[PDB]
Ligand binder design. Structure first.
Ligand SMILES: Cc1ccc(C(=O)Nc2cccc(N3CCOCC3)c2)cc1-c1ccc2c(C3CCNCC3)noc2c1
Length: 347
C-alpha cells in the first residue's frame, strides 16, 4: 500500500515525503541533489533523505540516476552505505519525476576525526582495516569508488566506518584542493584505462594522513602533485612507461629528472614498521603491482582485526546496462521499476 505523503518547502525546494519521515532538516546541497536529516518514526532511526535534482533532465543524468539506485540497492555490507528506503510521490510511471533515497544518517567524517582527534596506531589499524574490508566487498562487485577521500568516510563514536559518496568538472580538480589529493596518478593525468587499483592508491594516501595528521600529497595543481608523488615513490621505469598509453603523458613524464624511491621509514618517522611496509605496497606507481584489498586484509599490520570468515564478498552484480544506449524515458522506466521493486532491510 502507498503511504500518505506530505509537502514542505525546504530552501526553495519542494519535499514530498511519506508521513513516517519527520523533522526534515537541510544538511547538504548541490547540482545533482540535496539532503535532509530526518527521523523515521517507523524504525526509530535517524536518517538522511536525498532528493535527486533533475534526475531525468538528460540521457547522462537519467543513466546516472539509474546507476546510483542500482548500486545502493545492491550494497549490503557493514562498511558500505546501504539503502533503507527509496520512494517517489508519483502514482504512475507517467507522473514519475522525482526520486528520494533514504539511508542511515552519518555523523562525523574522517576529516573531522583527523583534524580534531589524535589517532593511535590501533585507531589507524581499525580504520584502515574497515576501509579495506568495505573495498574488498565493493571491488568483488566490480564497482570502483574512484573518489575515496576522508570526506567520503563516515565514522561513528565507536570508530566504526562506512564508505559512501557524498558527491553532489575540470575546475573542481584545479589548484590546491582536496578533490585531487587522494587520486591515483593514472586517473589524475589520464595515463591509461584505469581499474579498481585506483582505490588502493587513495587508501594509501588516507592511511599516511591518519599516521601523520597531514595530507600526503597536497599538490598546488596536477603537476606539482605529480612532482610530490614522484619525489616519494620514485620516477617511473621503462616497464611502467610502456604501459602509459597516452603518448602525450608518457613523453611528459620522461622529461623529468630520474629520482629514486625514498626511504618510507624516514618519511613516516616512528610509525609501526608494518604500517610502513603496507604503505610501500599500496603507494606503487604501477597499478598492476599495487596490493589489492583482499591481499591487504591478510597483511600482518591487521593481525588484531583480520577474520577471514567475516570478510564477505558481494552477490553477483549485473552492470551490463553500463554499455547500453537508451532514451531518457527508457532509463526513466528502468529506474521506476527499481523504485517499486525495492524491499527494505529485514528486521
Ligand atoms: C542520502 C544518501 C544517498 C546516497 C548516498 C551515496 O553515498 N551515494 C553513492 C553514489 C555513488 C557511489 C556510491 N558508492 C558508495 C560505496 O562505494 C562505492 C560507490 C554511493 C549518500 C547519501 C547521504 C548523503 C548525506 C548524508 C549525511 C550528512 C552528511 C553531511 N552532514 C550531515 C549528515 N549523513 O548520511 C548521509 C547519506
Amino acid at each position: 500500500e502507498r503511504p500518505t505523503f506530505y509537502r514542505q518547502e525546504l530552501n526553495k525546494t519542494i519535499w514530498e515525503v511519506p508521513e513516517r519521515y519527520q523533522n526534515l532538516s537541510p544538511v547538504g546541497s548541490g547540482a545533482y541533489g540535496s539532503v535532509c536529516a530526518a527521523f523515521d518514526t517507523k524504525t526509530g532511526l535517524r536518517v538522511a533523505v536525498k532528493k535527486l535534482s533533475r534526475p531525468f533532465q538528460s540521457i547522462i543524468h537519467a543513466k546516472r540516476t539509474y546507476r546510483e539506485l542500482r548500486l545502493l540497492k545492491h550494497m549490503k555490507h557493514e562498511n558500505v552505505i546501504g539503502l533503507l528506503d527509496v520512494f517517489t510521490p508519483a502514482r504512475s510511471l507517467e507522473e514519475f519525476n522525482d526520486v528520494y533515497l533514504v539511508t542511515h544518517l552519518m555523523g562525523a567524517d574522517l576529516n573531522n576525526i583527523v583534524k580534531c582527534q589524535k589517532l593511535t596506531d590501533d585507531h589507524v589499524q581499525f580504520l584502515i582495516y574497515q576501509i579495506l574490508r568495505g573495498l574488498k566487498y565493493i571491488h568483488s562487485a566490480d564497482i570502483i569508488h574512484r573518489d575515496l577521500k576522508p570526506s567520503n568516510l563516515a565514522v561513528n563514536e565507536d570508530c566504526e566506518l562506512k564508505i559512501l559518496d557524498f558527491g553532489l568538472t575540470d575546475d573542481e580538480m584545479t589548484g590546491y584542493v582536496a578533490t585531487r589529493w587522494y587520486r591515483a596518478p593514472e586517473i589524475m593525468l589520464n595515463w591509461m584505462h584505469y581499474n579498481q587499483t585506483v582505490d588502493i592508491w587513495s587508501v594509501g594516501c588516507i592511511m599516511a594522513e591518519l599516521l601523520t595528521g597531514r595530507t600526503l600529497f597536497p599538490g598546488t595543481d596536477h603537476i606539482d602533485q605529480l612532482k610530490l608523488i614522484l619525489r616519494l615513490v620514485g620516477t617511473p621505469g621503462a616497464e611502467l612507461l610502456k604501459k602509459i598509453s597516452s603518448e602525450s603523458a608518457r613523453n611528459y613524464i620522461q622529461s623529468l629528472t630520474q629520482m629514486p624511491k625514498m626511504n618510507f621509514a624516514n618519511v613516516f618517522i616512528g610509525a609501526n614498521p608494518l604500517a610502513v611496509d603496507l604503505l610501500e605496497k599500496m603507494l606503487v606507481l604501477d597499478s598492476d603491482k599495487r596490493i589489492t584489498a583482499a591481499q591487504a586484509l591478510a597483511h600482518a599490520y591487521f593481525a588484531q582485526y583480520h577474520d577471514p570468515d567475516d570478510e564477505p564478498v558481494a552477490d553477483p552484480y549485473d552492470q551490463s546496462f553500463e554499455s547500453r544506449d537508451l532514451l531518457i524515458d527508457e532509463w526513466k522506466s528502468l529506474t521506476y521499476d527499481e523504485v517499486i521493486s525495492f524491499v527494505p532491510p529485514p528486521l
